[PDB]
Amino acid sequence: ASPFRLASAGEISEVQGILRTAGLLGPEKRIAYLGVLDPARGAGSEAEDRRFRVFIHDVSGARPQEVTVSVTNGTVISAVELDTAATGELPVLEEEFEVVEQLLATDERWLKALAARNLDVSKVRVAPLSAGVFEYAEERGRRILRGLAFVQDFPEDSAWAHPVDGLVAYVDVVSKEVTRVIDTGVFPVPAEHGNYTDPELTGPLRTTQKPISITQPEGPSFTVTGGNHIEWEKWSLDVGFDVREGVVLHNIAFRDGDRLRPIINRASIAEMVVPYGDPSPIRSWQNYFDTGEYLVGQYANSLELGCDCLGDITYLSPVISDAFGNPREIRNGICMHEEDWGILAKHSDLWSGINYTRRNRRMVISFFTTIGNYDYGFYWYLYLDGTIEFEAKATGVVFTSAFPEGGSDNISQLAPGLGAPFHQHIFSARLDMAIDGFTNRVEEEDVVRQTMGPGNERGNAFSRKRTVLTRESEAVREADARTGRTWIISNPESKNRLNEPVGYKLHAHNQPTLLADPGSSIARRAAFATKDLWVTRYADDERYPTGDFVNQHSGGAGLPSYIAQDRDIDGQDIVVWHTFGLTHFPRVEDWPIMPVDTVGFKLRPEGFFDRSPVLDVPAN
Amino acid sequence: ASPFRLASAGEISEVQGILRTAGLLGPEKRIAYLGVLDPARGAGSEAEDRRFRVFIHDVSGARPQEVTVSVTNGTVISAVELDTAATGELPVLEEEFEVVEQLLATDERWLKALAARNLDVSKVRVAPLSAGVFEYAEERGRRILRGLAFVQDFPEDSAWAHPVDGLVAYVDVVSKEVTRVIDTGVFPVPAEHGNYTDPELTGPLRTTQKPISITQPEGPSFTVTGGNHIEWEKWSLDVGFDVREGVVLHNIAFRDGDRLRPIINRASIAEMVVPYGDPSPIRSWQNYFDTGEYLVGQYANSLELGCDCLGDITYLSPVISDAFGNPREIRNGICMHEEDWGILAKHSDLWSGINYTRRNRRMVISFFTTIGNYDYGFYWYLYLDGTIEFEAKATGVVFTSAFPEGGSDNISQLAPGLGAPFHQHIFSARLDMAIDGFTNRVEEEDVVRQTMGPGNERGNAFSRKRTVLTRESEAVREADARTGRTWIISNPESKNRLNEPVGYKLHAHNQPTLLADPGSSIARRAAFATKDLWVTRYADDERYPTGDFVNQHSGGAGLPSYIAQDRDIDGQDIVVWHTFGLTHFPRVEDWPIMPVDTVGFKLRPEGFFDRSPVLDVPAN
Ligand SMILES: [Cu+2]
Ligand SMILES: [Cu+2]
């Protein structure tokens, strides 16, 4: 029915069959990425044509390929061989993770390094980390993963408590060869365990927490049709899921009176990078593009009722492809529910004698993913008043190192001899705008202070200014918290009853952006992270701020390249890319398991409605 | 038993007698302010000497007085006559909100102004607005109030929809005479009504909201003893209430293992000002110190269950004094409860096979107040992980004016001909720190970017720097969101197991501070609002950032004066004053009644604990 429905196991199996029939999926082939494509602009298509895009890896060393297929027509739309040294390697395969430890286990250099530390190889876990791009010429064109070691004293031990510093190895996961093993010197391996379920560390568990029961006698207020179409308190949207981006929101619209008014055509976290700020050669190459390199959606957790999602929850169980094209379901991977959100509006008027109070609520769509030591929760919220918000919740176990004897300017101490390198978690929200339709524009709004004098004799006046971003070349903006800078997306052709263009205002948290030196590899590979806001003209092939192939890919693609087209964005089909993140200087409180920290952004209506859109909310 | 218990009706009754049996209280006198004083520094003096501070007004015209009485021994500690022209007028009296309209009703200038606009005097409401200080020497030393008119078509009509622009009056509430009436010209009085309970405006109330049930079958996890002593999930504190400040938190401490560790000795919102940025002479003098001039606590609303506070709520009904010293109870003025706060910590570890998830919770202490057209919710939150947070929720009806023909750079249009002057809501949180005791210090922490080169060849390194604020002369700080600036309060004499001084980090929202010109009267009277953070040496008589008597005070009082003492704050008994606020450019969405908007701040432990303090939280 709806062209925005979630992919079904059948569609994935059909893609597999189409590829096989086309001779593109032999026994040496592996699916590194597979996702459904959004319908093309303009519903000119008589019927629906479900298309899937796939990245095909070859374990024998042959060139990989990018393929698009129409499962509807059972055809291969396009198939191109990729030159990875130029355009980038495919995303890391889940099957390649175990390869790093396995290969290193029999390498003489690795074994000698472990013996020098009196470590039993059988107990040494190796984290399969993306390699990035640096000065190792032999890595160009090859799929390389770098490994950092952690000791696990026993099956249920938390290896992160025992980092093996001064050692790092590089491995070619295709030819199965250890290219390099670097040992800069022995560091004491932190002895304290970090087992947060061990009574010896947790102590007696608290018995002081009484239960909080959240229930809905008449069920939830939202309805789900077509498997993923949501309707809740005037909001309308489709909940999609992609193995790379995770949860994607489609066709966010608000029912104002008798008309369905669009606001955002597509919303997603198009990239997220975790750059480390420790200059040690052991970790200075460390930059994890969880979204682009690992594909966060792929590792989404199955959420337990009453534990991960509390209350009356409706689940979606998205299906993705395994490495062979077989469908795999992520049971209860997406939670959907509405939750009370305190007071919405309130006023006790003396003159009228009327006391008015109304409560707020928000629709929540979320999922949680795990990538090695990190665990991230992605939350999208829709409020009664028209506000749209995204929130990222970062938790898990901090990535560790040894804590140098004389201290460090780039690492904090968590436990005796245990360090945690400084790093950032930076996201990029891609908002394909559709404020009352596709004809949109963006204005940067700053508060304007005024000087006391003629026309402002008492010096109390203050105003604001709005600057339209007309071409992509002038649409790379930075935050200015001091002047209350925000960005307004409006429709110059759609005006409210007061003759003003309708719009939505993006409120950023104004957290620090990418800290790395502008001449660094990461500053180029994650150029999007250096500025708070980017605006581009919509294009079918401009999906990620970092390009299609991020793994071991130098600069050359992504937002910087798109912006160069300097297209018209003043009253056109535009896309907003907002960078926002957390700068983490680990605290002792983050060890052995870190409490959630958050970051996000929100958009509030700005003259979108003709008056408050919640006057029809009952007292109840 | 506790010296921090809430004031009882009996204590207030005693205060009344003392004043009486001293000729201090009589038919010409009025209690402008009455509140209990906190215990003196040093509990070495067994037995608490419950003392109350009182501000006495005189309707006759005699000089007001500040009196400190001792309820414990029923005596008058001190009584001083005040020179208002010097130290400022007393807070506006509730009984004075009538006089402005009543007086103007029989004034020929006012009546002539209304007749010219064809307005029925019986339908004209007049807001009793603080006067401030502006080139009117005649007012100096006099108790003045300015009045702005709003038309109320009928008893249940919202007068805010019909502001009468181009007209303003100044009145003397003691001599009862209209000192002046300014009529700059006739402006059309907006005709549209703003009655948000009128079916024609609200339209059919939605019937789509299914109920959300929040219950605690076994009761709350917190205990209340001594009437206002709270104990919840290791937290310990005393919930106090003042007619000026509202809810005040005392002795915030955390039970870490076997010891109760103090964190904050006293937390309150010491001031809240609402400066307007409309240069029109009709409102250019507009600045409302809701806390300092009106006393937000006295107007606290009685919170309805299931409406204002949902779930298992434990109420506090603070008692205050009326204008004559009689005790008045504010039924259910304070809400206390705990609410679920999503995921606390989570990690699914591949190597250990252990999947771990824990839920977070927050203790909530709040109240809601109404000042004319505004309604503010004050919420304090205590989290399982040690985080302390404050949040202000602003709602009510926007203060209106006429919308000028030809537009305005300082007023927004909400409805046909209806304007909303730009303004700010700026709060000052007074945090009397006690990090593991009174020996504290504050450090400004900035993220530090590093240049690619020797020691940082890959240009990935980044660090942080901390600057200790040693003297008050260097303790007036500004925000710097770009460099992730925060402030850490630590105890140099109390170290964690890693030999690092324990501390708490204050995270600000970095919203714009006071926008008015530096030389404006408001910039001088609300100097605290021009900077984000102030640190002073504790002093029993330095309670408010604006001074004790804000109404019609020339300026420079409060923080600017305290800081001038340039006292030592490096490892001393100190107080942190954080300025934070909302800059409001009213939207159509804010009319006829505005949806809640928020602002606040939080403090998170920074090396305060030896490891996560929530490892003992059960899976539940
Ligand atoms: Cu982190
Ligand atoms: Cu406001």
Q: Where are chain B's structural domains?
A: 1-87, 94-195, 196-619
Exposed/middle/buried for B353, CB within 10 Å: 0-12, 13-18, 19+? exposed
**Resolution of the coordinates, Å:** 1.7
Nearest alpha-carbon partner for B338 in B221, B187, B495: B221
Say whether residue A11 is in contact with chain B using an 8 A CB cutoff: no
Cα B122 to Cα B98, B173, B479: the distances in Å are 14, 20, 50
Count of H-run helices and E-run strands, chain B: 7, 34
Residue B182 is assigned to a ligand binding site? no
Which tokens sit at A571?
Answer: 């009253």
Q: Supply the Cα-derived Rg of chain B in whole angstroms.
A: 26
Residue A208 is assigned to a ligand binding site? no
Exposed/middle/buried for A185, CB within 10 Å: 0-12, 13-18, 19+? exposed
Q: Which of A157, A238, A242, A290 is catalytic?
A: A290
The architecture of the domain spanning A94-195 is Roll (3.10)
- A351 contacts B284? CB cut-off 8 A: no
Q: Is the link from the previous residue into A592 a cis peptide, with omega within 30 of 0?
A: yes
**Ion ligand 1 nearby residues (CB, 5 A):** A 584
Report the alpha-carbon distance of residue B100 to residue B178 in Å, rounded: 9
Closest-CA distance of chain B to residue A37, Å: 30
Interface test with B, best of A230, A458, A585 (most B CBs within 10 A): A458
Nearest alpha-carbon partner for A600 in A236, A269, A270: A269
Percentages helix, strand, coil for chain A, rounded to the nearest 5?
15, 45, 45
Question: What's the gap in Å between B480 CA and the centre of ligand 1?
Answer: 21
Element (H, E) at B359: strand B355-371
Which method resolved this structure?
X-ray
Report the alpha-carbon distance of residue A182 to residue A167 in Å, rounded: 6
Say whether residue A223 is in contact with chain B using an 8 A CB cutoff: no
Residue B38 is assigned to a ligand binding site? no
| Angle at alpha carbon of residue A130, lines to A559 and A519, rounded to 5° | 50
Instruction: Kindly report the backbone phi and psi dihedral angles of residue B103, in degrees, each rounded to the nearest multiple of 5, phi listed first.
Output: -65, -55
Report the alpha-carbon distance of residue B513 to residue B478 in Å, rounded: 9
Say whether residue A615 is in contact with chain B using an 8 A CB cutoff: yes
| Angle at alpha carbon of residue B352, lines to B350 and B356, rounded to 5° | 80
What residues contact residue A348 under an 8 Å CB cut-off, 6+ apart? A355, A356, B301, B370, B375
Pairing state between β A177-183 and A167-172: antiparallel
Report the alpha-carbon distance of residue B411 to residue B419 in Å, rounded: 6
Residue B289 is assigned to a ligand binding site? yes
Report the alpha-carbon distance of residue A67 to residue A363 in Å, rounded: 36
Residues in chain A: 620
CA dihedral over A563, A569, A574, A580, signed as positive or negative: positive
Instruction: Outline where A408-543 has alpha helix (H).
Output: 521-525
What residues contact residue A265 under an 8 Å CB cut-off, 6+ apart? A250, A251, A252, A432, A433, A434, A438
Pairing state between β A29-36 and A51-58: antiparallel
At CB < 8 A and 24+ separation, what contacts does B145-150 make?
B145/B92, B145/B96, B145/B99, B145/B100, B145/B170, B145/B171, B145/B173, B146/B170, B146/B171, B146/B285, B147/B100, B147/B101, B147/B104, B147/B171, B148/B282, B148/B283, B149/B114, B149/B124, B149/B125, B150/A351, B150/B124, B150/B125, B150/B126, B150/B400
Report the alpha-carbon distance of residue B382 to residue A564 in Å, rounded: 49
DSSP A15: H
Say whether residue B96 is in contact with chain A using an 8 A CB cutoff: no
Nearest alpha-carbon partner for A469 in A388, A401, A553, A567: A567
- Which of B339, B409, B455 is opposite residue A279, by nearest beta carbon? B455
Query: Whose structure tokens read 């919170």?
Result: B303
Q: Is CATH 2.60.120.260 what the domain over B196-619 is classified as, yes or no?
A: no
Question: What's the gap in Å between B310 CA and the centre of ligand 1?
Answer: 34
Q: Which residue type sits at B41? A: R
- B278 contacts A307? CB cut-off 8 A: no
Query: Whose structure tokens read 């430890």?
Result: A101
Q: Which of B290, B436, B532, B548 is catalytic?
A: B290
Q: Which residue type sits at A295? A: L
Active site residue A290: yes
Which tokens sit at A203?
Answer: 């102590």
DSSP A600: E
C-beta of residue B401 within 8 angstroms of C-beta of residue B421: yes
Active site residue B290: yes
Cα A582 to Cα A390, A513, A520: the distances in Å are 14, 9, 20
Beta strands in B418-530 (DSSP E): 418-421, 423-433, 441-449, 462-469, 476-477, 486-495, 501-508
Contacts with B340 from chain A: Cβ below 8 Å? 212, 214, 310
Ligand in closest contact with the CA of A425? 1
- B202 contacts A613? CB cut-off 8 A: no
- Which of B344, B483, B589 is opposite residue A595, by nearest beta carbon? B344
Topology of the domain comprising B1-87: Nuclear Transport Factor 2; Chain: A, (3.10.450)
CA dihedral over A259, A265, A267, A268, signed as positive or negative: positive
CA dihedral over B139, B140, B145, B146, signed as positive or negative: positive
Classified as helix, coil or strand, B125 is: strand
What residues contact residue B406 under an 8 Å CB cut-off, 6+ apart? none
C-beta of residue B514 within 8 angstroms of C-beta of residue B526: yes
Nearest-by-CA chain A residue for B419: A498
Q: Is the link from the previous residue into B592 a cis peptide, with omega within 30 of 0?
A: yes
Nearest alpha-carbon partner for A370 in A593, A522, A588, A199: A593
Classified as helix, coil or strand, A146 is: strand
Pairing state between β B327-329 and B334-348: unpaired
Pairing state between β A144-151 and A124-130: antiparallel
Query: Whose structure tokens read 């210090």?
Result: B441
Which tokens sit at B189?
Answer: 């009085």
* Residue B298, Ramachandran bin (φ over 0: left; ψ between -120 and 50: alpha; else beta): alpha
Which tokens sit at B346?
Answer: 């989570």
* Residue B116, Ramachandran bin (φ over 0: left; ψ between -120 and 50: alpha; else beta): alpha
* Residue A84, Ramachandran bin (φ over 0: left; ψ between -120 and 50: alpha; else beta): alpha
Report the alpha-carbon distance of residue B292 to residue A142 in Å, rounded: 69
Instruction: Kindly report the backbone phi and psi dihedral angles of residue A473, in degrees, each rounded to the nearest multiple of 5, phi listed first.
Output: -60, -20
Pairing state between β A486-495 and A501-508: antiparallel
Query: Whose structure tokens read 């402030």?
Result: B487
Nearest alpha-carbon partner for A577 in A213, A372, A272: A272
Check if B1-87 and B94-195 are the same fold.
Answer: yes
C-beta of residue B319 within 8 angstroms of C-beta of residue B327: yes
Residue B425 is assigned to a ligand binding site? yes
What residues contact residue B485 under an 8 Å CB cut-off, 6+ apart? B444, B445, B446, B447, B479
Exposed/middle/buried for A218, CB within 10 Å: 0-12, 13-18, 19+? exposed
**Ion ligand 2 nearby residues (CB, 5 A):** B 584
Return the HEC string of B258-298: CEEEEEEEEEEEEEEEEEECCCCCCCCCCEEEHHHHHCHHH
- A215 contacts B616? CB cut-off 8 A: no
What residues contact residue A108 under an 8 Å CB cut-off, 6+ apart? none
